[PDB]
Amino acid sequence: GAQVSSQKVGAHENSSTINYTTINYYKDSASNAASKQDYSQDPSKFTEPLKDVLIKTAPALN
């Protein structure tokens, strides 16, 4: 049940893709560490909540 993923390598040694291994030891998902691989989303629901969303090169009020 080993889980393998790629690290995002910041500073590189003078030595490519590097990995790390994760194994969950507990039955309750609460006990698990954080994956930290998280998906991002559109600001739109906050920055543009308009019924008729308009395009930036056009007049906001028409």
Binding site: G1, A2, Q3, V4, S5
Partner: peptide
Amino acid sequence: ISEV
């Protein structure tokens, strides 16, 4: 294993 599950290599992602």
